[PDB]
């Protein structure tokens, strides 16, 4: 489906994926791998294909953990939006989507904004927003 997609960083040129309901890492891009597949199904929300549920936290947490919970269009823990330069974070706050720093496998929120808390859709330079809605 046209609205799915992989979430890519450039510096490590890895791919989000999804493992498990509480266990979202990164791995080799591979565009036929269901648990690599994402998709937005509201203006802020964005749901993993493989595991029918939504990208989220257990609070708008430094640090704090970004794996997969029931999607709820009333959850502010799993509401996203994209900054500039394909940054991207919680929606209303300054904590972004990271990866690659302390050897931590899992996805995390993030206070710093250089290159690990930037991401593409796979196969361009856009940021993931160019995928959803808004």
């Known amino acids: 489906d046209a609205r799915q997609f992989l979430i890519y960083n450039e510096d490590h040129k890895r791919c989000v994926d999804a493992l498990s309901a509480i266990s979202v890492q990164t791995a080799t891009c591979n565009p ?25 936290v257990p609070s708008k947490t430094d640090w704090a953990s970004v794996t997969l919970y029931a999607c ?3 959850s502010e823990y799993q509401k996203w939006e994209c900054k500039n330069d394909t940054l991207f974070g919680i929606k209303g706050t300054e904590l972004y989507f990271n ?3 302390r050897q931590e496998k899992n ?3 993030y206070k ?20 959803g809605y808004e």
């Open 32 to 56: 036929e791998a269901e648990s690599q597949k994402f998709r937005w199904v509201s203006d802020s929300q964005i749901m993993s294909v493989a595991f029918k549920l939504c990208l989220g």
């Open 107 to 109: 996805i995390k929120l």
């Open 99 to 101: 990866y690659g720093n």
């Open 112 to 131: 710093g904004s250089g290159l690990w808390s930037r991401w593409k859709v796979y196969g361009t330079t856009d940021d993931l927003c160019s995928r």
């Open 72 to 74: 709820d269009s009333k």
